[PDB]
């Protein structure tokens, strides 16, 4: 998913 | 952009 | 710094 | 591990 | 995989 | 580049 | 400086 | 060996 501002 | 396995 | 499961 | 500036 | 700066 | 065995 | 498995 | 900029 995403969060803060990292994505996988 | 994107590197390895993430996307910031 | 931290949050989640990363350091940047 | 670490790479780019992103440590997991 | 990649670490530091360089994949290998 | 790439080189050999190592990318950067 | 050296890291892992890398010297430079 | 080294080759390149890197000794491994």
């Given at each position: 998913?995403?969060?803060?501002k990292?994505?996988?």
């Open positions: 998913x995403c969060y803060x990292v994505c996988t």
